[PDB]
Design a protein around this nucleic acid. Structure first.
Lengths: 80, 85, 205, 80
RNA sequence: UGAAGAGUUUGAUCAUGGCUCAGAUUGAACGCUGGCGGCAGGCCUAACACAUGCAAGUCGAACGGUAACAGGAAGAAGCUUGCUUCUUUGCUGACGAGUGGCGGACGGGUGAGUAAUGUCUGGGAAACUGCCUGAUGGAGGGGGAUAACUACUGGAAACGGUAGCUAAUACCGCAUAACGUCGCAAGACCAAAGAGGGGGACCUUCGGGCCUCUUGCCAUCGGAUGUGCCCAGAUGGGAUUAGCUAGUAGGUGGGGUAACGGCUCACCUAGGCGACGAUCCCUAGCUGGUCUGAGAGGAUGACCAGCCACACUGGAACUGAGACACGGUCCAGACUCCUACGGGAGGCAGCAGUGGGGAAUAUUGCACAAUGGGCGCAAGCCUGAUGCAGCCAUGCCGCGUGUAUGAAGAAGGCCUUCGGGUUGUAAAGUACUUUCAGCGGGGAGGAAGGGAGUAAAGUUAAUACCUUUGCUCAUUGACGUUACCCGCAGAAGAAGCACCGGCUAACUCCGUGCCAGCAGCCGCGGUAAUACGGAGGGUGCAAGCGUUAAUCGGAAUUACUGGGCGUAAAGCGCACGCAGGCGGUUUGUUAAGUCAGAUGUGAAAUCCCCGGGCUCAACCUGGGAACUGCAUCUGAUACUGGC
């Protein structure tokens, strides 16, 4: 059961939040199939927010994986 | 308490009085073919073979013996009737 | 931790005035400085090289106020990317916020500057910084906040700095009490081009 | 084919099998000297004409019995 | 590419040689002392047992029923007599249990068992997929019980036994037979259910029909992760441990599964493993990695990611896509609590607490607000998950315990070229200033969906209901004395501990007189002991200091890198044979060794190296190296191997 999701990364105080394609078996953030970018809450001196690989997500959505709502609108605002 | 074991303790006997009944029934219709090879005639044995397939098909079309076991039982007994004189 | 207790014993062991109780009590010494650390030294002299190496290990870090663990942590960044550890370490110790606030004239000592940094009075890149373990970036701004500019101790620190020479690797406008740090200094421009053979072998084994 | 080797027969006591000896051809991982190192395969043979001390050619396959994942191809040299 | 060497046998002196040490790593331990913020760590022992409470529930948009709240209806007309009480009824929004469904196999805990056909790396062929999310069709109608509830029989009761009622999207047939399967063949076989809303024309007990939106049922073929099965190549130690194996090794007939196979039953054979180490014992879970050192090779696999195995103990079964099933079933064992004497029921190696076993290891913490996962068409519910506080110097990191004034040196001590020196500017008393804590006033961000509006030819019957990405408005917070900001008091709330002959930095007075003691090593102790005691002074680390242990280093002290055998350990009395190790001088062939170039794999994290942000580093991370390998092609052909 594969899905495209915004994964919990860096937990306490300053998290990074990576976006991944992964299988719903077992763990919340265990094994993944492709890591496609980062949400990154920090804008301090940097333009490195909301990044996504538009070749890799298109190779999964509607052709093997589902998409999570917290990524389903991110795909339209990538590094905007 | 309840979980799933309390239900399974009564519904698995209700299944043993339906599914395992048909397992034993099918095995009896199979045993009745090994008698028909002692009738002195090939057409009397072919009569008893098409008396046995209709219960093997009932377990194959329902998807309990469809992967190999139906094709194995049908082939094994087809060879015993093609062996007659 | 840091050292506490009698102060003249410190200037006596360093053989040098530390600006500790150094008003009219500094004039023509008569205070055992440059004379008598402890009380003995002339009758059964051992002259041990381990003792001079131990003396260098105190000497090199106490001037910056940094403790052993802090000093070996800067040496870890001097010993990577080949040797020349005495010149590469100099750039790290001279880049400290307590050293830079002292070179901008706001303290009469690095400890007085470190104690002005703790008192929330110093801001870097437009925001307040209260740690001396910071490192200043080149062509970046260092400034003092309004509620500290008229303090008699800070007034006397800028009054001392304007009676001395200027460090060329920074600039400060006394009409704003603000300006920029240009670069980390060079060991041959901060003093002279010489070899010090102990500091290049210091610490470990 | 995935793996194909040549080796020497050491047991012919079987009616659908033989035991074949093969070499590792390996550098010792710390003492650096080369060694032959003889390892055994139990090989499928339904013809039963190859015999002890003969040289044989063998191919790797799916399991045919327990400890039996190789089958005979050719008799390479006859030892009489 | 990184680079610690020294001490001791003796009259000794050079060699040789045992012993021992400085360092790094740790979840560590004892003891003395211990101030303030942060990140991490906090039963590696008995795999020993557990009081109290909580850990996986959920759905009335299937529905027999009604615990609860407010309403609708019907009664008593209540006393609780001026209100909206009491008692019924599923009418309605709803929902304590019951039927039914989804999921309970994950999220946590742990290293006992296991030297393993377990596990990792790299490949392989005979093998799986409920749900999720597509794709083509069906979408008719019946038959048969029962829980809840009510009684009978026993108990105080959990609850056993026994009669009766009754509903279904539950249970089972018939017709149909698909995108399924079979015989030459008439043919032979496997289904299924609606439900909530809305409305144009017309009918209407204006609920119903009909149409239509949202969402369900049944069959079959995909999408894509992951699971079973097998084979090379490796894994702690050992041979003054040598034999071990009747399902073991192999054949010949019959069976079982989703598939492999001595998986399994029977009839026959004597094989197989083992010195390149079987049998057996102690120890030990596997990998990414971690990590000592000059490096090799080991050591070490707590934390984070992925495997194995366990679930007090042993052994089975039921059910499913999936179980030799943590907190399920069931039998038996070992241990325990409750009794009115019917007997009954358990297992915290989950989260918090408690007792043993020990050198030794958190609160009987706040809430579900958000986020994940489970259920729900959805508002929601569930959570010791998770958010998010405490306790403990166990490691590391940022930051402390404030400033000025003070004598040819007060009083005391210590040592007196008896002249002075020195603890010490330290103290007294006198004045200034507060980081950190304590205490106030202000005060975020984590908040969005949801409630209402607006808009979208939304899917329709375009702006009813409903519904969604944005937009306009009122709002939803456990943590919290939070992040951050400004103030209110007072130096107030704060400094230890070894070390001082030599290695080894700090000096040498008196007492004791081989005692009393010291100690890591050398060595010290009988009348000035630089080594003990007692001293005053002096050095170094520092919320740590001393005193140890584990695992390494120094250790070449198991020798690859890198030894010893004339005499400092050991050349075995000599010749014969031999698995293995080495092999003339050339041409031709092969590409196993080797070497070259491609396609892969060596996950994410990480040392090294280059960029960025948190007040710096740690931390959070963008990138490049690297994991020297192991596979799948293509290629050179000198030399070792093979021909």
């Amino acid at each position: 059961m594969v899905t495209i999701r915004l994964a919990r990364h860096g937990a306490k105080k300053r998290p990074f939040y990576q976006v991944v394609v992964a299988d719903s078996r077992n763990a919340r953030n265990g094994r993944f199939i492709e890591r496609v970018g980062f949400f990154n809450p920090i804008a301090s001196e940097k333009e490195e927010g909301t990044r996504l690989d538009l070749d890799r997500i298109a190779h999964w959505v509607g052709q093997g994986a589902t998409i999570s709502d917290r990524v389903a609108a991110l795909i339209k605002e990538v590094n905007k | 308490n309840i979980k799933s074991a309390k239900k399974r303790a009564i519904q698995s006997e209700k299944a043993r009085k339906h599914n395992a009944s048909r397992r034993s029934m099918m095995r009896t219709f199979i045993k009745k073919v090994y008698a028909a090879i002692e009738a002195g005639d090939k057409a009397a044995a072919q009569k008893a073979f098409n008396e046995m397939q209709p219960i093997v098909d009932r377990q194959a079309a329902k998807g309990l013996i469809h992967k190999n076991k139906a094709a194995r039982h049908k082939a094994n007994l087809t060879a015993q009737i093609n062996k007659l004189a | 931790a840091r050292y506490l207790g009698p102060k003249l014993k410190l200037s006596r062991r360093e053989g040098t005035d530390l600006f500790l109780k150094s008003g009219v009590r500094a004039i023509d010494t008569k205070c055992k400085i440059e004379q008598a650390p402890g009380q003995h030294g002339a009758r059964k002299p051992r002259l041990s090289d381990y003792g001079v190496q131990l003396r260098e290990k105190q000497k090199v870090r106490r001037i910056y106020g940094v403790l052993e663990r802090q000093f070996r942590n800067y040496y870890k960044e001097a010993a990577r990317l080949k040797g020349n550890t005495g010149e590469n370490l100099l750039a790290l110790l001279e880049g400290r916020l307590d050293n830079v606030v002292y070179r901008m004239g706001f303290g009469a000592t690095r400890a007085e500057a470190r104690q002005l940094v703790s008192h929330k009075a110093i801001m870097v890149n437009g925001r307040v910084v209260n740690i001396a373990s910071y490192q200043v970036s080149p062509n970046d701004v260092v400034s003092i906040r309004e509620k500290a500019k008229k303090q008699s101790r800070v007034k006397a620190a800028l009054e001392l700095a304007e009676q001395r020479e200027k460090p060329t690797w920074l600039e400060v406008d006394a009409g704003k009490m603000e300006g920029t740090f240009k670069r980390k200094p060079e060991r041959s421009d901060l003093s002279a081009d010489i070899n010090e053979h102990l500091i290049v072998e210091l610490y470990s084994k | 084919k995935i793996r194909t080797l040549q080796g020497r027969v050491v047991s012919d006591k079987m009616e659908k099998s033989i035991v074949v000896a093969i070499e590792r051809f390996v550098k010792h991982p710390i003492y650096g000297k080369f060694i032959k190192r003889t390892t055994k395969l139990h090989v499928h043979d339904e013809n039963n004409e190859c015999g002890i001390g003969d040289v044989v050619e063998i191919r790797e396959c799916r399991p045919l019995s327990k400890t039996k994942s190789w089958t005979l191809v050719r008799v390479v040299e006859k030892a009489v």
